[PDB]
């Protein structure tokens, strides 16, 4: 079900190793359900090329236009499992903290803060 589980650590270290030769400016972003998410529908995919200029306040809009909320649906993106400390941080520096060692950036959704 979970992104880790359908590719091998041999298989997404080199999918990061391309987007990184064919999307230099990309960064590598893995965005998934809560695994007890009930109200919020699931992306239409898995693994999403973001511009690295853009903060995570602006990351936070995309999916959410992603999603096609509405403006009084609630909606947390929790980085590599944890609350962000700030969504001012350009995502260029979350990566380069909070990236996995097999190189892509996870993140989780929910309509909850507690999940
Ligand atoms: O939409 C939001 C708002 C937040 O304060 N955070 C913190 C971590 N992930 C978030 N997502
Ligand atoms: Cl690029």
């Known amino acids: 079900k979970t992104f880790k589980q359908r590719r091998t650590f041999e298989q997404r270290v080199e999918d990061v190793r391309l987007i990184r030769e064919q999307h230099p400016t990309k960064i590598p ?3 998934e359900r809560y695994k007890g998410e009930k ?4 992306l239409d995919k898995t693994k999403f090329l973001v ?3 853009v903060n995570m306040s602006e990351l936070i809009k995309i999916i959410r236009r992603r999603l096609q909320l ?3 649906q609630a909606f947390f993106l929790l980085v590599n499992g944890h609350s962000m400390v700030s969504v001012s941080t350009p995502i260029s520096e979350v990566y380069e903290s909070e990236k996995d060692e097999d190189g892509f950036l996870y993140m989780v959704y929910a309509s909850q803060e507690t999940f």
């Open 51 to 53: 511009p690295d200029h």
């Open 29 to 31: 972003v893995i965005i």
């Open 39 to 42: 109200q919020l529908p699931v």
């Open 70 to 72: 509405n403006a009084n």
